Amino acid sequence: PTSDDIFEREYKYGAHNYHPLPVALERGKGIYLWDVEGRKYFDFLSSYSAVNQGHCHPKIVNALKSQVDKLTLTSRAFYNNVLGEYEEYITKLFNYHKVLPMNTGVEAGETACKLARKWGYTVKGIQKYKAKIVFAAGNFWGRTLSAISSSTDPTSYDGFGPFMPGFDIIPYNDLPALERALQDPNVAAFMVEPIQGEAGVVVPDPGYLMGVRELCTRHQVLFIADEIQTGLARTGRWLAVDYENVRPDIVLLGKALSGGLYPVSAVLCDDDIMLTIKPGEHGSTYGGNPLGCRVAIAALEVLEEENLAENADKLGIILRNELMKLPSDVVTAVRGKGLLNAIVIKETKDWDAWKVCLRLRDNGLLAKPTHGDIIRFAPPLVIKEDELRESIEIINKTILSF
Amino acid sequence: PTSDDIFEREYKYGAHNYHPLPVALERGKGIYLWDVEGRKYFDFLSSYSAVNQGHCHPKIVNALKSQVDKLTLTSRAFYNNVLGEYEEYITKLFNYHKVLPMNTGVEAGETACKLARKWGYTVKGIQKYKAKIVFAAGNFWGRTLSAISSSTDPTSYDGFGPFMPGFDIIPYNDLPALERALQDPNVAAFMVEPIQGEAGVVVPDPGYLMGVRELCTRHQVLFIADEIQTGLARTGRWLAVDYENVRPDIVLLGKALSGGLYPVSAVLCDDDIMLTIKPGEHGSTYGGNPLGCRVAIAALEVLEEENLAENADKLGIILRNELMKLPSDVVTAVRGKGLLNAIVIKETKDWDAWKVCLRLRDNGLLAKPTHGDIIRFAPPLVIKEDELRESIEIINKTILSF
Amino acid sequence: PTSDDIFEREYKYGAHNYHPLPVALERGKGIYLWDVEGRKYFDFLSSYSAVNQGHCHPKIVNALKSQVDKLTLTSRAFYNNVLGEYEEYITKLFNYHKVLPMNTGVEAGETACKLARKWGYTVKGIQKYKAKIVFAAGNFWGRTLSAISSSTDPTSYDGFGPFMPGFDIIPYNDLPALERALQDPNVAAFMVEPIQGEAGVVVPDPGYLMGVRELCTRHQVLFIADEIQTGLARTGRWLAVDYENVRPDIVLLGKALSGGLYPVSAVLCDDDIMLTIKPGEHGSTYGGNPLGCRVAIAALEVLEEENLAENADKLGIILRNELMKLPSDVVTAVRGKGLLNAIVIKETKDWDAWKVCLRLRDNGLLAKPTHGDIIRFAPPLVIKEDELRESIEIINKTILSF
Numbered sequence A, B, C: 001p002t003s004d005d006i007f008e009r010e011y012k013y014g015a016h017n018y019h020p021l022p023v024a025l026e027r028g029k030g031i032y033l034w035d036v037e038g039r040k041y042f043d044f045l046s047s048y049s050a051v052n053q054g055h056c057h058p059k060i061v062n063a064l065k066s067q068v069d070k071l072t073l074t075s076r077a078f079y080n081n082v083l084g085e086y087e088e089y090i091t092k093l094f095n096y097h098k099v100l101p102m103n104t105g106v107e108a109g110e111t112a113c114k115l116a117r118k119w120g121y122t123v124k125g126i127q128k129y130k131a132k133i134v135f136a137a138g139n140f141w142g143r144t145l146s147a148i149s150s151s152t153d154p155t156s157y158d159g160f161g162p163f164m165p166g167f168d169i170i171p172y173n174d175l176p177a178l179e180r181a182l183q184d185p186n187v188a189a190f191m192v193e194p195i196q197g198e199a200g201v202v203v204p205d206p207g208y209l210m211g212v213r214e215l216c217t218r219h220q221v222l223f224i225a226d227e228i229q230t231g232l233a234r235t236g237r238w239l240a241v242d243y244e245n246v247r248p249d250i251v252l253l254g255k256a257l258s259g260g261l262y263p264v265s266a267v268l269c270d271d272d273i274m275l276t277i278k279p280g281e282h283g284s285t286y287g288g289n290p291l292g293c294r295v296a297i298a299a300l301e302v303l304e305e306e307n308l309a310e311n312a313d314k315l316g317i318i319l320r321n322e323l324m325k326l327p328s329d330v331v332t333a334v335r336g337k338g339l340l341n342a343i344v345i346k347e348t349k350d351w352d353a354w355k356v357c358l359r360l361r362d363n364g365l366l367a368k369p370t371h372g373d374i375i376r377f378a379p380p381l382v383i384k385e386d387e388l389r390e391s392i393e394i395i396n397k398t399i400l401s402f
C-alpha cells in the first residue's frame, strides 16, 4: 500500500538485480504516471522506449481487450488467423520480404545472430563454426549469455561464466575499424544500434550508417540494425537509420512495437536471409501469438495515424535547444535525436545524476541516469509542446537548484 | 637560415609525414631550446620523454665524445669490450637476468612480441602460430606494420595494408576485460604502458597494475610493460610500475636511455623467457654497439646521481596543483605522474589546443597537443622549482589570454 | 678486461641471440681493429657494410663532436635547423624528390612497405587490405615480425608466431617468375636487393635489374631497391643498381649512411609516392634528429671526396681474381662486386667456414661465414692495394694450411 511498504516487500521477496529510483507507480496514462500517494509525474523514460504511444493508449488497449475474449495462444504447432495479417502489415510497412516474430528484444537479437550464422554457412560458404559477428563497443542488446558476451560493460558480463565465441568487438562510430574488421572472410554480420541508448545516447557522426552499409555490402557481410530502442518514431523517423536512407540487411524491432502492453519483438529481412532457417530450426512458445499480434498492429497504427515521428522530430529540437541553455559547469553535453535525448552531468563533490533524478522526481519528473553522470530524457511521443515546455522548466529549476 | 626558410626547405625535400609546431630550433641545453632567431624557450615536451636528463647533458656528451675516438661499431659478428659492461649495469639496476639491446622503441616492442611468441610455443606449449598477444586500446608503441596492427587509432593503421594476425585488443584500465581475454589458453602475453602517453597521458586507476600482474601470473601469461616513455624517472620512479611494486615479466626501455644522444633501446627479462631465442634468431646491426652503450651507461648514471626521480615526483605535484587552479570552462582536466602530465582544453568556437600551443610558443614555452584537445606538459627532469614556477606562469597567462 | 672475461660477462648478462666469432675488439681505425690484448686485425666484414668509410673516420667523428655540443634531439614535434639541409643534400645526390628519415635498416624497409601499401590503395586503387608486396627468396631486411614474414630462412621466422599477410615470395634472379607474379593487379610493389648479402652475396645475372624495372613499370608496380648493404660505394657505384642504369621507384639506404657512428636510415622516392603518407601517419622518435643528420652528411661527403666507389670497383677485381687462384677442392666459388665479395668453402670431414674464420682470425684477418660454407670478404672501402694484397696473402696461407 505505501511506497516504502512496496519497496520493503520487493526487497524481501524479489531478487536484487535492480536498484530503481525510489518511486512506486500504480497508474499511467499518456505522458503521465501516478504513484501510490496520488502524486502525478511526467514520464521522461518511456519504459526505455517501450511506451512511445503513451501509457495505456486506448486504441492499443481496445485491441488487447477484443482479442483476449477470442484467443490468446495456440502455439506455433497450429495456425491462428491473426499472425498472417500482422506479418503482411509489418513487412509492407517496413518493406522487407518476411518477419520472424518473437517476444523480447534479446530474442530478436538471438534470432538475428542465428540468421547471420546460418546464412554465413549455407549462403556465404563460411566453414562450419568459424563464422563471426562484429559488434560495436558500448552495445547493449539484452541479458542472455550471448548478449553479455558482446558487451564491453563489466556490469553485464563480469562473473557470468565462459563467454560465447565468435563475437568480435570494434569501437563504435569508426568506419576504419569496421573496414579493418571486415577483412576476415569469416565475418557473417555486423550488428549496430543507429544510436546507442544504454551507452548514453551516443549518436554516431553523420555518414556513419552510410559507411557501414557500403562496407558491409562490399564485403558480403550482413548489416544488422538493432532498432529495438531507436525505431518506431522514437528518433523522429520510422527507423533511426532512415535519417541516412540506409537499408540494413536485418532490422530488429521490439519495445514500442506493442505500446508496452505485451512483449512483442520482430526481426525483418528478405528471403535470401530469412529462409536459411528451415521448419523446426527456430522458434518460441509465445512468438507470433494472436494477442500480441493484435496489439502490435494497433501500436503500429497509432504511430502512423498520430504522426508521432514528425512530432518527435519537431519537439526533440526544442528539448535539446532549451537544454543547451543550461550552464556548462552543470550540463557538459546535450545529445539525441527525436525524443531520445540525454544530458551529461558534471559530477562534482556534492551533486551527481542520481541526486538530480531524485530531486527531479520531487519536482514531478521521472528520469534515470544511464552511466552515473548521464541522464536520459525520453518522454512519450504523444507529448505536446506546452507539456514539453512545462517539463523543460521542471528540469531547469531542478538543475539550477544545486 | 631563417625559420620560414627551414620550414620551406623541409617541405620541399622531406616527406610530409609530420606537421610540427612552427618553431625551428638550433640549440638546446638542459630545459631550454633556442630557435634560429635566438629566441629561448622552455622545453615542455622533452622530445617525447627522450631528454629526461635535459638537452646535451655534459656527462652523457662526454661519454659519447670519449668513445667515438675509440670504436663505434663492430657489429654483433664480433664482441666489443663495452656491451657486457653495460649489460651487467642495466640488468642489476633493474634486477633482471638479461637484457636484449636494440636501437629504437618499436624494435624493443617487436623483440618483446617475438620473445612472447617464442616463449608461448617453446615453453607454454601453444600450438604453432596460434599464439596471441593482447594490447589495450589507445596503445602506441611505434610505426612498424606490427605496431600499427595493435593500434585503435585510424591515423596509424588506415591505409596500411593487411594487418598482423594474433593481436587482440581490450579496453585500457579494465581488469574484468583482461581476465575475460586471458581465458584463451593461446594468449602468450599482455603488453601495456603503465600510463598511456600518446593516448593523452591516461593514468589507470590505482590497483590496475597489481591486477594485471595477478591476472597474468594466474593464467601463465607474460606481463610486458612498455616503459619506453614512462620509465627512467619520468613519472617519479625508475619505472612507473614501481608505484604499485609490480614486477612485469618483460620491461621495455628506450628514449631517455641515451639522454637523446643516440637511439638506444632495451628489453629486460629473466632467463626462462630471454633464452627462448637462440643464437642467430634475432638481432640488429646497431643493437648493442660500443658508442650507444657508453651513452646509455652515462644517461642512467645521471638519473641516479642527480636523483631525478624524486625531483620529478616533487615538482609534478606542484605542476598539477597549479594547473588545477585554472578555470574549468578552460581546462576540463589535469592529469599525470611525475613530469608526465597533460591538460584537456575545452575546444570551443575560437580556441583549441594547437592555438594554445602556438601562443604558448609565443610566450616562450614549447609544447604540443596529443589529440586535438589534449596538451602534454613534460619538461626535462632537471628542471628546478623556480624554473617550473616561471613556466607555470607562462602557461597561466597564455591560458587566460583567450 | 680479458677476451674470455668479456665473453663470460656477455654470456651472463646478455641475451644469447648471437654466437659471434670469439674476438673481443676495443678499438678500430680505418681498415683495422684491435682486441683487448692489443692484437691488430684487418676488418673484412666492415660491420656488415656499415663502416664503408673505415672505423672512426676523422671527418665523420668531427661532425658528431661539433653537433653534440649544440643539439641532439628535439623530436619531430618541432623543427631543427639541420634536417632540411641533409634532406636537400641526399635528395639531390640520389636524384629523388624527397627522403623519409628513419634510424635502422628494418625501419626503412617497413616505411617502404607502408609507402607501397598506402600508394597501392590511394593511387593505384587496390581495394583496402588486398595489396601485396612481392619479395625474392633469400631476402634479408631485418628482424621485425614483418621482415621475418618475407623470409625463406627458418632461422628468422621459425617460432615467431603468425606471420604478416600480403607478402608473396618468388625465386631471386628470375624474370619469368616476377612477370608471373605481377599478373595479380593487387601487387603494389616488389622489394629486391641488387645483390643479396646475407643469402651469401648472390649476384643476379646481368640484365636482371633492367628486367625488374621493365616488368614493374609495365604492371604499375613499385620497384623497391634495398640498397641498405649494397649501396654507398660498397659494390663500386653509389648504388649497385647503377651498374645497369636502373632507377628504382624507392631506394632504401642505411648502415654506411653514418659511417657506423649513428643509426641513420633513409627511404628515397618521388612525390607521387612519398606524399601518399599524410602528416601524423608515420614517424619515429629519433628519425631525422640533428646529430644523425650531421654524421650522415659527413659520411656521404667522405664517400664522394675520397672517390671510394671507384676504389671499391678497382680493388674488388683484384680481390676476386686472386681468390679465384685458390684450389677448387678448397674454394668452390668466388663472387661479388666492388668490395662486397664471398667465397664458398667446400665443407668436408675436417674443415668448414667457421674453422677457416677462426684460423683467419689467428692470422690477423676478421671475417664471418654467412651460411656455414660461405665466407664474406668486405673490407672498408678506404683500403689500399698493398693492404689488400697483404690481407689476400693472409687469406691464401690460412686457406692453404688445412
Ligand SMILES: Cc1ncc(COP(=O)(O)O)c(CNC2C=C(C(=O)O)CCC2)c1O
Pocket: A048, A104, A105, A106, A107, A109, A140, A141, A142, A143, A193, A197, A198, A226, A227, A228, A229, A230, A254, A255
Ligand atoms: C538496443 C536494445 N536492443 C535490445 C534490448 C533488449 O530488450 P529486452 O530483452 O526486451 O529488454 C535492449 C534493452 N533495453 C534496456 C533494457 C533495460 C532493462 O533490462 O531493464 C534497461 C535499459 C535498456 C536495447 O536497448
Ligand SMILES: Cc1ncc(COP(=O)(O)O)c(CN[C@H]2C=C(C(=O)O)CCC2)c1O
Pocket: B048, B104, B105, B106, B107, B109, B140, B141, B142, B143, B193, B197, B198, B226, B227, B228, B229, B230, B254, B255, C076, C282, C283, C284, C285, C286
Ligand atoms: C610508449 C612508447 N613505446 C614505444 C614508442 C616507440 O619508440 P620509437 O621507435 O623510438 O619512436 C613510443 C613512441 N613515442 C612517440 C613517438 C612519436 C613519433 O613517432 O614521432 C610521437 C609521439 C610519441 C612510445 O610512446
Ligand SMILES: Cc1ncc(COP(=O)(O)O)c(CNc2cccc(C(=O)O)c2)c1O
Pocket: B076, B077, B282, B283, B284, B285, B286, C048, C104, C105, C106, C107, C109, C140, C141, C142, C143, C193, C197, C198, C226, C228, C229, C230, C254, C255
Ligand atoms: C640488405 C639488408 N637490409 C636491411 C638490413 C637490416 O638493417 P638493420 O639496421 O640491421 O635493422 C640488413 C641487415 N644486415 C645484417 C647482416 C647480418 C647480421 C645482421 C644483424 O646482426 O642483425 C644484420 C640487410 O642485410
